[PDB]
Amino acid sequence: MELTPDQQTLLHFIMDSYNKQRMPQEITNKILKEAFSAEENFLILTEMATNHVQVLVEFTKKLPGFQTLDHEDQIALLKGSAVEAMFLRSAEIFNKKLPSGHSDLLEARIRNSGISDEYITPMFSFYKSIGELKMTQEEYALLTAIVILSPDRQYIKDREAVEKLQEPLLDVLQKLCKIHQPENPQHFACLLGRLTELRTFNHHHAEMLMSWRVNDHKFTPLLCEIWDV
């Protein structure tokens, strides 16, 4: 029912590794400060996406048991979760409470960033769906770890070894759901449901970058490897 000392240890360790990320206030303040062209926003996106991959590899290496997995499976998990984890992190930043009228301006700035209108509606539908869940910092950290340690990822040789590492993270998350929302017993299932909505963003990620309203789509070598561009 309640968290065990081992689970609390796992939780604080996941929280410490996760907090090594970029400040949500820093990112939203830049977007809200002034309007940028589709070209400036494309450059901001590639820089933010390159840094996110680097921070994600460090968070993943610290995930208990990750370094014991086969080296090829290690790459397949990272390649399979990188884009999903970046969208989950954008949804987290999107739903952070801000002064009156700021989240309306943040939405309008993201709508006019340069992204193709075809992707605007599915993106905001996911962001709003995440927001309705009123997720805590610990829930975002554990859900990101669960997304990375997905055994049902493509090209995984040893799925059972991945399952063994994901299961204790799922157990901690379920206990937090029962504690933070005892009136909503559907909460844990709702979180796992939102992960299938995440997976549907992975299908058109390359197109989302290529269809950006710019003439030149320049990427860093690391981005070319993670996003398939």
């Binding site: 080296h71 790459i75 990272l78 070598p221």
Partner: peptide
């Protein structure tokens, strides 16, 4: 061949 990712994982 994911050379940069392999490098970021190994060292």
């Amino acid at each position: 061949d994911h050379q940069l990712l392999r490098y970021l994982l190994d060292k």
